[PDB]
Amino acid sequence: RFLSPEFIPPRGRTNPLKFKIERKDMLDRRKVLPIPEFYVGSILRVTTADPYASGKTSQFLGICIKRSGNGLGATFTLRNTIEGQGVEICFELYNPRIQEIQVVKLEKRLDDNLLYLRDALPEYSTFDVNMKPVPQEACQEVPVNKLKVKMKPKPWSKRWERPNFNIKGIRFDLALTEEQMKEAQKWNKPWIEFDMMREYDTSKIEAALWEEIEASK
Amino acid sequence: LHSKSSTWWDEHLSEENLSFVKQLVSDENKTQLTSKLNPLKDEPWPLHPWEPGSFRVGLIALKLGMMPLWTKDGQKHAVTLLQVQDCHVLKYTPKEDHNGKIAALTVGGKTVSRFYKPDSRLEFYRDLGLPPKQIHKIFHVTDNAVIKPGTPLYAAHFRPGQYVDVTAKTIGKGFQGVMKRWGFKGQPASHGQTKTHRRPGAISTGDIARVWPGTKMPGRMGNQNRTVYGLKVWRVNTKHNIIYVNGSVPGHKNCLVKIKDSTLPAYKDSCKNLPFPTYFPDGDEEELPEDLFDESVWQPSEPSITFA
Amino acid sequence: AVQKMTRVRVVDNSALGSTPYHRPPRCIHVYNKSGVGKVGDQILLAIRGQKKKALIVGHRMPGSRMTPKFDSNNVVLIEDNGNPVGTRIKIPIPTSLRRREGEYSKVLAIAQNFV
Amino acid sequence: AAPKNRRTIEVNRCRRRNPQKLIKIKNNIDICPECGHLKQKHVLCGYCYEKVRQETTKIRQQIGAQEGGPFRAPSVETMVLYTGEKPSEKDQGKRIVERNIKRPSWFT
Amino acid sequence: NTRHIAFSGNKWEQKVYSSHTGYPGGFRQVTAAQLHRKDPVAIVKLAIYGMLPKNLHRR
Amino acid sequence: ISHGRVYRRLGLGPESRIHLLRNLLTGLVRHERIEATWARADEMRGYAEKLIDYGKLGDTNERAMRMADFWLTEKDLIPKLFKVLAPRFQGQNGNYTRMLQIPNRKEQDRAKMAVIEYKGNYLPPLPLPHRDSNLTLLNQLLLGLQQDLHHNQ
RNA sequence: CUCUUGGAUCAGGACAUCCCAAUGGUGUAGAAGCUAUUAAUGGUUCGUUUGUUCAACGAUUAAAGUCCUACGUGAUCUG
Ligand SMILES: [Mg+2]
Ligand SMILES: [Mg+2]
Ligand SMILES: [Mg+2]
Ligand SMILES: [Mg+2]
Ligand SMILES: [Mg+2]
Ligand SMILES: [Mg+2]
Numbered sequence A: 001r002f003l004s005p006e007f008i009p010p011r012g013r014t015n016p017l018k019f020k021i022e023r024k025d026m027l028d029r030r031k032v033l034p035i036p037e038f039y040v041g042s043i044l045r046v047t048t049a050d051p052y053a054s055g056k057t058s059q060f061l062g063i064c065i066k067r068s069g070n071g072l073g074a075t076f077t078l079r080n081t082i083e084g085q086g087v088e089i090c091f092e093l094y095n096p097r098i099q100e101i102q103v104v105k106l107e108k109r110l111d112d113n114l115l116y117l118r119d120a121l122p123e124y125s126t127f128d129v130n131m132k133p134v135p136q137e138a139c140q141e142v143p144v145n146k147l148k149v150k151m152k153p154k155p156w157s158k159r160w161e162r163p164n165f166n167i168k169g170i171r172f173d174l175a176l177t178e179e180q181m182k183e184a185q186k187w188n189k190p191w192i193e194f195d196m197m198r199e200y201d202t203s204k205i206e207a208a209l210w211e212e213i214e215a216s217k
Numbered sequence B: 001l002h003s004k005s006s007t008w009w010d011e012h013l014s015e016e017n018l019s020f021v022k023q024l025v026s027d028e029n030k031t032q033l034t035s036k037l038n039p040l041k042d043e044p045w046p047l048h049p050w051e052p053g054s055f056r057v058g059l060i061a062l063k064l065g066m067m068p069l070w071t072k073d074g075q076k077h078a079v080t081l082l083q084v085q086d087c088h089v090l091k092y093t094p095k096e097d098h099n100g101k102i103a104a105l106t107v108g109g110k111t112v113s114r115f116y117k118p119d120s121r122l123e124f125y126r127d128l129g130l131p132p133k134q135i136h137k138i139f140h141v142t143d144n145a146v147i148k149p150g151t152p153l154y155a156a157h158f159r160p161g162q163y164v165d166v167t168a169k170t171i172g173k174g175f176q177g178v179m180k181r182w183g184f185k186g187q188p189a190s191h192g193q194t195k196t197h198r199r200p201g202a203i204s205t206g207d208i209a210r211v212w213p214g215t216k217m218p219g220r221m222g223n224q225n226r227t228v229y230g231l232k233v234w235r236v237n238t239k240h241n242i243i244y245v246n247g248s249v250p251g252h253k254n255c256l257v258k259i260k261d262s263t264l265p266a267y268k269d270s271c272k273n274l275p276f277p278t279y280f281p282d283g284d285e286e287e288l289p290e291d292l293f294d295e296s297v298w299q300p301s302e303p304s305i306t307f308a
Numbered sequence C: 001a002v003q004k005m006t007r008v009r010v011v012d013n014s015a016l017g018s019t020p021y022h023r024p025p026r027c028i029h030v031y032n033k034s035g036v037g038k039v040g041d042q043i044l045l046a047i048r049g050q051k052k053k054a055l056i057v058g059h060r061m062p063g064s065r066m067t068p069k070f071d072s073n074n075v076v077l078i079e080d081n082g083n084p085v086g087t088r089i090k091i092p093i094p095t096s097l098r099r100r101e102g103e104y105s106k107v108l109a110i111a112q113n114f115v
Numbered sequence D: 001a002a003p004k005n006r007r008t009i010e011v012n013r014c015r016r017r018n019p020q021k022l023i024k025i026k027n028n029i030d031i032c033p034e035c036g037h038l039k040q041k042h043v044l045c046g047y048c049y050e051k052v053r054q055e056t057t058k059i060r061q062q063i064g065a066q067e068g069g070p071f072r073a074p075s076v077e078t079m080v081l082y083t084g085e086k087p088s089e090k091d092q093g094k095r096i097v098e099r100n101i102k103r104p105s106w107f108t
Numbered sequence E: 001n002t003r004h005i006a007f008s009g010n011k012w013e014q015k016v017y018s019s020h021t022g023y024p025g026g027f028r029q030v031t032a033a034q035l036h037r038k039d040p041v042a043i044v045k046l047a048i049y050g051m052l053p054k055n056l057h058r059r
Numbered sequence F: 001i002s003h004g005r006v007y008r009r010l011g012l013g014p015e016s017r018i019h020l021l022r023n024l025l026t027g028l029v030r031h032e033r034i035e036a037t038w039a040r041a042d043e044m045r046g047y048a049e050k051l052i053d054y055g056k057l058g059d060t061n062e063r064a065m066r067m068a069d070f071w072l073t074e075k076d077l078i079p080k081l082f083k084v085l086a087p088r089f090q091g092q093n094g095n096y097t098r099m100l101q102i103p104n105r106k107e108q109d110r111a112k113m114a115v116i117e118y119k120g121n122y123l124p125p126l127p128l129p130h131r132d133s134n135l136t137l138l139n140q141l142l143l144g145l146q147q148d149l150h151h152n153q
Numbered sequence G: 001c002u003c004u005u006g007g008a009u010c011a012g013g014a015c016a017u018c019c020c021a022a023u024g025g026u027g028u029a030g031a032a033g034c035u036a037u038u039a040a041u042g043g044u045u046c047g048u049u050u051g052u053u054c055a056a057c058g059a060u061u062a063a064a065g066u067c068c069u070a071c072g073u074g075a076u077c078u079g
């Protein structure tokens, strides 16, 4: 059972009614266009109509590196390198000028954000434009690709080694001395994981949404 | 002691009566709300036709939140949601009493509890036979557009395509400094500055030997009435009484706002097309669609937009 | 977001940009009411002890949804008359350039890839 | 910056006798039915609460003697008995605390 | 009939009344005719105010 | 501006706040009735409730055991939580603690005080406030009104 | 024969107007310009010293105005 991220409400003081109203419109678009299941790390091809030109479409293939947004404003960003020039485009799922979304390769990665690929070697971001879809098996669990990438020289876009990011998909041993690793651990904040008032349990909310979505079907 | 003591409704209520009184009050609200559902069959005041220069009453709504929206050209617009909730007409002043050239009508909304209110307000509402409302405001209405007190109002009073005006109290930020409050530049961080980073410079010239009234200084910011002009209406939901308005509205979520049609010069006499006195569903000449849209709006469940 | 003294990359086949030099080019002026330069903006460039006009075609700062964000700040050299200095471009160029107010047809002709 | 003039007793009387600076009177004082001592409506009675805490100390003092050391918390429920009382069947296998005095009237 | 007072000479166009709000730029000067248009009683009232003794009993 | 901040600032910092609350929670489990200052007890009340939820999960749950180990400094009390307190509150869905304000401390700082406890303990009962009986004059009139409305439809 | 000013911050005001606005004359064909009348509305940029006795240079702008307010302003800061 895969419940898409946007359906889960964020916590706050907003009324539940505003969420019910938004959900109705989201479901209606899904009947017209089907939104496939995917996770950060999977490769996608998205087709959209080009506004500047007249009745001419566009296609972009890349790996999904982030999923954000709630409700009708949900987004996802996918990355690729063309002629040795890196490009990223941020897409909204419910934008009406998206013709089709195709999951070329469905897979999961160790982390739920891959923004550190900007600092990794170019090979880990390049994907063949014309690669054909790979088979999928219904009676299975989604695969977890456990690749650990290699990084370029130390000056980076962010300090990925620091404990807040919680990166588990970088080969730090190759790039950093053990002395530097202890230097980073001075920012740990160990107590955060053990305080019970910072945790948001959404199991019941997830369950209730499931039947209503299925019931509407 | 032969002296004053203070009380509250729950002080003397026993265990059984505590729940009973809660239930009794809730039923009283429902009976009084249903009775007012039929204005047209309750001796309505005469309904005059529209004439140039006419002004119409407005509503009180609650701010739900925001969401995106798209037009048939693919342009994306952020929109805010306003819900009408138990809006009634309360009191009428004739032109001479109000002291304005025009007459006035008072509107209330958002039913509230009766327990922690002054007696004066409760007596006022008992006369009108309605449960109390959180907020009252005043609207300037012409004689032809006057409406009898006690008549419910609904979101369908507005229709898509018309511009509107909204006013509400802004978010309160407390006592604030000159940099945040008035956007003052401040001073450099380094090069020898001594304990002067975010402070104002000179108040004024030395010659006057005083400070001009109205000088900009630190003080409490926010929590003031502000108005936004010329916001289009994109869509209306008849079932839940929801209005969608272009752009931003002042205040936090769950805050009451005042809605009235635009007073800008361009939209001077657009009221003729809209229901002139108000919208009455009691008439039941036709049942409205659940959702009302504007032509440029791209509705969901329509086919994907192709920029042919 | 290109500004005065920003270092930029010349994505062009012109000899002036192609030839390696000990200093990378730097922006000297932005032809805008604001100082910030975005895609479709001309700037004044300092190259090899010389000044030349140039046009921004990409940058690393986020924009609105559904538009491409590049990994480097890319520029094209433009002659005083407005004719491109170079004869070819290989890196992908955004399609937003077509409709933005300005003269972009000449550069679009020389560019093969549009993203 | 230093004062340029002495402030007079008349001006000073107006600053410190302003109604803003005076002690406000309280309207939430009531009498306790059980003991007859005073209390605030939203607060527990001090005299009545004082009784309970004294008994609580006695019980805990006895609990300390039985255990005999730290880190001896039982894994079974506890119960208190007074002279003249014997464990019931439901009391089987539960720590029993013994008090010399008779059961207090208020304690149930 | 304070609206029907009369001025000798060209006083309607030459007599100026001045006021200040108290804020920078709050100085306003208006002629007699303009003030008479806005308020039909101001001219007569201002004349009487000036001729009374300048003390608290004036008000 | 502090809109939407659900935590108090206590101690010497964020980590110090957790440690102070942990010490109070450990004392509550052992003794089952505690006195602290009103603000501190109110902040710790939330954690006390959530601890009884992990206890319900059971001894064999790996996550529950890890959480209990961190929040109880004295280790003779982990058996107590999983085998005494958790069984006691099986029926209820919440409201495991009772908290009341106590007269101000008489120690020259005059702090606002409170008493917090777990329901169902063996200690002498607290002197709680009782609502008025139904035999009083006002209650009877309301009772009369209820009977008429119930009987007459 | 000799011997207080800059900058930052925030600006109050005058009109002897630099730009924006309404007009007259022309050795005003159009487009550019030169001159005069009326008006204080808001605005009036960013960097740099090899030579220059209170100067100059680069890139721009619709314009980069002239002045008064104990250097307007050091119990707000600084060379
Ligand atoms: Mg955010
Ligand atoms: Mg950076
Ligand atoms: Mg917009
Ligand atoms: Mg606030
Ligand atoms: Mg600064
Ligand atoms: Mg400092």
Ligand SMILES: [Mg+2]
Binding pocket: B208, B209, B210
């Ligand atoms: Mg003076």
Ligand SMILES: [Mg+2]
Binding pocket: none
């Ligand atoms: Mg006095």
Ligand SMILES: [Mg+2]
Binding pocket: F002, F003, F004, F005
């Ligand atoms: Mg708060």
Ligand SMILES: [Mg+2]
Binding pocket: G011
């Ligand atoms: Mg000024």
Ligand SMILES: [Mg+2]
Binding pocket: none
């Ligand atoms: Mg002049």
Ligand SMILES: [Mg+2]
Binding pocket: none
């Ligand atoms: Mg001074």
Ligand SMILES: [Zn+2]
Binding pocket: D032, D033, D034, D035, D036, D037, D045, D046, D047, D048, D049
């Ligand atoms: Zn008592």
